[PDB]
């Protein structure tokens, strides 16, 4: 049975909620984005009205298979009138195609829905701008001051210069990267761009990657193994054994990897700065694990927040704690009286 903070008061509505079969009263069902958390129960056999951005159906029709005349697309920017509710749908710096839903309640209620999202200063300069929001169901996922990473273009800017310095010491070097879901594609594109050399992956991934509206995609992938100097590989193969066993398959055009992991947060954040970070290495293969993060930081969070000044904030992340529960709610009445809200 679908949990209360999946639920929009006041609507037929409900957000990220395909896995609890029908749900009693709900006329239309958004998704926020393809992950699979959050998709979990979509497929051909769906027949409720699916409202998502462009992106999102793309992937939902090419690779879950749900039929065309289920999938509502929405612009972005651009206030919609679904099942007599006003909802706009805003970028939420996340993966590609995922967004917030604003709701304009019938009786005069205004709730923002984050989905999944990395908070930043140019959400500030949206429609959000423009009005009052009551409700904010909130992306908790690192909602404790202990949770700091870098700027995405610093975490880039490391990734460049670390694979063109090695690929120009050793021009036999091949660069790997790890991946298992959609999102953080500017790593192994970055790196690609960098060397010169298109991306090479498998048929199941080169598909995913077509649904994704980037510019001149084209250009940079490829299904081609053998013309690729930066190869994908799920990222369960980014480890000594996984790696070697991957280079015996190149046919000895290369002697040397090196692979990056693109995570969250791990601890080594709360000690090592993005300059100071080393590889782990065996033999002739070096792994880099690099706090690429789609979520927002706690001070990202926190600034938000602090400026949207919400009356209510409903936690969509950690939620299934007593502990993780009271910490979210100090660290929420800290930011109100502080801030004078
Ligand atoms: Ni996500």
């Known amino acids: 049975t679908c949990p209360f903070y999946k639920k929009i008061p006041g609507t037929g509505f409900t957000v990220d909620a395909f896995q609890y079969g029908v749900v009693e009263g709900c006329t239309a069902y958004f998704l926020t984005h393809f992950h699979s958390d959050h998709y979990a129960g979509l497929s051909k056999h769906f027949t409720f009205p699916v409202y998502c951005s462009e992106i999102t159906g793309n992937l939902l029709k090419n690779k879950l298979h749900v039929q065309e005349q289920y999938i509502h697309p929405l612009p972005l920017d651009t206030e919609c009138i679904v099942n007599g509710v006003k909802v706009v749908l805003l970028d939420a710096n996340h993966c590609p195609g995922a967004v917030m839903i604003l709701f304009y309640l019938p009786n005069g209620t205004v709730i923002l829905h984050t989905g999944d999202f990395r908070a930043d200063p140019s959400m500030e300069r949206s429609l959000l701008a423009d009005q009052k929001v009551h409700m904010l169901y909130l992306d908790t996922t690192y909602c404790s001051p202990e949770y700091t990473f870098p700027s995405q273009q610093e975490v880039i800017r490391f990734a460049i210069n670390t694979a063109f310095e090695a690929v120009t010491l050793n021009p036999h070097a091949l660069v790997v990267c790890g991946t298992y879901s959609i999102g953080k594609e500017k790593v192994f594109l970055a790196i690609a761009d960098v060397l010169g050399s298109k991306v090479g992956m498998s048929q199941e991934k080169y598909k995913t990657l077509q649904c994704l509206n980037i510019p001149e995609i084209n250009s940079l992938i490829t299904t081609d193994m053998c013309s690729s100097l930066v190869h994908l590989l799920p990222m369960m193969q980014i480890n000594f054994k996984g790696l070697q066993s991957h280079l015996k398959k190149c046919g000895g055009k290369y002697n040397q990897i090196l692979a990056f992991r693109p995570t969250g947060w791990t601890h080594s954040n709360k000690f090592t700065r993005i300059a100071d970070v080393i590889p782990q290495t065996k ?28 009356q209510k904030i409903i936690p969509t992340v950690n939620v299934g704690t007593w502990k993780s529960r009271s910490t979210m709610e100090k660290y929420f009445r800290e930011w109100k009286l502080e801030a004078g809200y």
Do not use: A, D
Request: charged share 20%; net charge positive; hydrophobic share 30%.
């Open 283 to 310: 033999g002739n293969i070096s792994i880099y694990g690099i706090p690429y993060s789609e979520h927002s930081s706690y001070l990202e969070m926190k600034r938000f927040v602090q400026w949207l000044k919400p």
